Amino acid sequence: NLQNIIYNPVIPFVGTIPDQLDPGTLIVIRGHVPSDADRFQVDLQNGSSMKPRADVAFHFNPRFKRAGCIVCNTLINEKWGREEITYDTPFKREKSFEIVIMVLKDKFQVAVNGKHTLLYGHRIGPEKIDTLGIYGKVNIHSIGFSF
């Protein structure tokens, strides 16, 4: 079932993932976007090194300026790849949310508040993911895993 690794963590949060993200694994993140929020990110990482900066297999980046959007990308050897921008974003300032990330064989599937939001094909073997980090202006109520 779901095994939360932490509640109301101080942001930025960087934690180690208890088990390998094998296809079928779910990542559940419940939080809230503060009214003065410009953006925030959830990064599935390979290690928690800050320098050199640890690779980010999956960069889930909601942005709030203008109409808003969600930028997804991958950071390999401290270099960002091709961005995959999703314009149909459900995130809003002053609103709560539950993010469910499904780890499939060839990609991540993300749904927010029960509604499908986006897909992102693996650019790095998901098996190299052992750390989860949450940065930016966002309040997190919980982070859990379903292996």
Ligand X SMILES: CC(=O)N[C@@H]1[C@@H](O)[C@H](O[C@@H]2O[C@H](CO)[C@H](O)[C@H](O[C@]3(C(=O)O)C[C@H](O)[C@@H](NC(C)=O)[C@H]([C@H](O)[C@H](O)CO)O3)[C@H]2O)[C@@H](CO)O[C@H]1O
Strands 69-76 and 40-45: unpaired
38 binds ligand X (CB under 6 A): no
Does the annotation flag 73 for ligand binding?
yes
Q: Phi first, then psi: what are they for 115, rounded to 5°?
A: -110, 130
83 binds ligand X (CB under 6 A): yes
Where in 76-115 is the site for Cl ion (CB under 5 A)?
Answer: 104-106
Indicate the DSSP class of residue 89. Answer: -
* Amino acid letter, residue 20: Q
119 binds Cl ion (CB under 5 A): no
Asked if residue 19 lies in contact with residue 145, where contact means CB atoms within 8 angstroms, the answer is yes
Which residues are bridge partners to 84 per DSSP? 72
Q: Using the minimum distance from each CB to ligand X, give the nearer residue, 25 or 29.
A: 29
Q: How far is CA 53 from the centre of its chain?
A: 17
12 binds ligand X (CB under 6 A): no
Q: Which does 80 bind (CB under 5 to 8 A by kind): Cl ion, ligand X, none?
A: ligand X
CB of 88 to ligand X, least distance (A): 17
- Residues lying near Cl ion in the complex (CB under 5 A) are found at 104-106
**Which residues are part of a known binding site for a carbohydrate?**
63, 73, 83
